[PDB]
């Protein structure tokens, strides 16, 4: 039932790496402060997403055993998970509790950010399904690690090596779900089910960016490697 001492340490190490990310309030502060034009919002997105990828690579390199994977398979895991990790982190930020009325304004700012109408409704559906799960910061960090270490990405040559890195994290996440929510014995499965919804965003992410309601879609060199754009 309990976490073993090694699992506590593992969880204990992953949270520290996860918290190197930009603080949620830094992000929601900028958005809530002024309304921006769709062009300024696009720039804010590419700047945010470039910083996010940089930190995600440092987080990924600290995952136990990742650095002993074949070098081509390491690239394939990062490329295959970067967009999913960005939306999971966006959902975490969106669901942070804020002073009265702030989340409504944040939703309106995002609705009016320049993103295409086609995409606003699924995005909020996913954010809202993520908020219903009442995840802790440890659960977000673990889920991000599990997303990154997915053996079923393309071009993974040695899935079996990746599986043995993913499984200890799945075991810890399952123990937390039983501890943190013993009345809901479907909670672990529901977290894992949300991952399949994340994968759909990865598959539409290019069109989501190019349909942004701006005249030019300029991406940074790092984002062009990670995203299927330009």
């Amino acid at each position: 039932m309990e976490l073993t001492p090694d699992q506590q340490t593992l969880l204990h190490f992953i949270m520290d790496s996860y918290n190197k990310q930009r603080m949620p309030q830094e992000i929601t502060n900028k958005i809530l402060k002024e309304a921006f034009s769709a062009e300024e919002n696009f720039l804010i997105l590419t700047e945010m997403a470039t910083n996010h990828v940089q930190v995600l690579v440092e987080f990924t390199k600290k995952l136990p055993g990742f650095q002993t994977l074949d070098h081509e398979d390491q690239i394939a895991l990062l490329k295959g998970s970067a967009v999913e990790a960005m939306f999971l982190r966006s959902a975490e930020i969106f669901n942070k509790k804020l002073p009265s009325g702030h989340s409504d304004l944040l939703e309106a700012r995002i609705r009016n950010s320049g993103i295409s109408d086609e995409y606003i409704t699924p995005m909020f559906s996913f954010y809202k399904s993520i908020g219903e799960l009442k995840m802790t910061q440890e659960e977000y960090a673990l889920l991000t690690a599990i997303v990154i270490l997915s053996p079923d990405r393309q071009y993974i040559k040695d899935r079996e090596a990746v599986e043995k890195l993913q499984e200890p994290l799945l075991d810890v996440l399952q123990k937390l779900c039983k501890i943190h929510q013993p009345e809901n014995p479907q909670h672990f499965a529901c977290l894992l089910g949300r991952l399949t919804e994340l994968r759909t965003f990865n598959h539409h992410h290019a069109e989501m960016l190019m349909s942004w309601r701006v005249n030019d879609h300029k991406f940074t060199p790092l984002l062009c490697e990670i995203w299927d754009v330009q």
Partner: peptide, 11 residues
């Protein structure tokens, strides 16, 4: 081709 990524992975 994935050079910036390959670079950040090695540094």
């Amino acid at each position: 081709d994935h050079q910036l990524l390959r670079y950040l992975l090695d540094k």
